[PDB]
Each structure stands twice: as structure tokens, then as C-alpha cells.
Ligand binder design. Structure first.
Ligand SMILES: *[C@@H]1O[C@H](CO)[C@@H](O)[C@H](O)[C@H]1NC(C)=O
Ligand SMILES: *[C@@H]1O[C@H](CO)[C@@H](O)[C@H](O)[C@H]1NC(C)=O
Lengths: 49, 48
């Protein structure tokens, strides 16, 4: 807390929450591709994306 | 799809039980901008 806390908020660090499948152990995912919900294609921020 | 929504200080509370929750309709809504889930996977709601 006394090394990685900013009064305005620390947005430099992130986590991944949306992906098609869970990660196998010791696997690294770095892509920032958008997530698709259902079968509707995704091209940007919006419904199901 | 309620026509009238309650105020923030008087937020309406509703209880839903003994039924099947269909989250596909929830995902189908277009004007949805902010959707955050904590403690559970949003894509696993249809299973849990
Ligand atoms: C390795 O890359 C392939 C092809 O993109 C992908 O399907 C697979 O999940 C990746 N495996 C790991 C362990 O990152
Ligand atoms: C508001 O909550 C009441 C019970 O407190 C319920 O009967 C009513 O249907 C709710 N209305 C809406 C629009 O959710």
C-alpha cells in the first residue's frame, strides 16, 4: 500500500476478466482483444462487447 | 422495462425466486453501458 497507492488512483495495473476459456496453469495472456458475448460480431465498445 | 423508476434514496427492492433466470435477454439489451460483476464470472451466470 505504501509503495503502489496513489491518491488519484492507480490505473497503471490491470487484470483480465473476460475471455472465452479459462487459462491452463502457467499460461500468460497479453492480448487486449475485445470480448464477444453470444454470436454477434464485435467491432468496438457496445452491447455484448 | 418499468415505465417509472424509484429515486436513489428510495430505491425499490424486489425479490425473485422459484424461477429460471434467463441472462441472454439481459445481454440482449443495447443501451447497456456499465456492467460490472464482483465475485462471480458474468458469463457463468447461466450455469451458477
Ligand atoms: C499458444 O498459442 C496458441 C495459438 O494462438 C493458443 O491457442 C494457445 O492457447 C496458446 N497456449 C498458451 C499456453 O498460451
Ligand atoms: C417495487 O417494489 C414493490 C415491492 O416493494 C413491487 O411490488 C413492485 O412491483 C416494484 N416495482 C418495480 C417497478 O420494480
Amino acid at each position: 500500500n505504501k509503495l503502489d497507492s496513489k491518491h488519484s488512483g492507480n490505473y497503471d495495473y490491470w487484470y483480465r476478466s473476460l475471455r472465452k476459456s479459462k487459462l491452463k496453469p502457467f499460461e500468460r495472456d497479453i492480448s487486449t482483444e475485445i470480448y464477444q458475448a453470444g454470436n454477434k460480431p464485435c467491432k468496438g465498445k457496445g452491447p455484448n462487447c | 422495462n418499468a415505465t417509472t423508476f424509484a429515486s436513489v434514496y428510495a430505491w425499490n427492492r424486489t425479490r425473485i425466486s422459484n424461477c429460471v433466470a434467463d441472462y441472454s435477454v439481459l445481454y440482449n439489451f443495447a443501451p447497456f453501458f456499465a456492467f460490472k460483476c464482483y465475485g462471480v464470472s458474468p458469463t457463468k451466470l447461466n450455469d451458477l
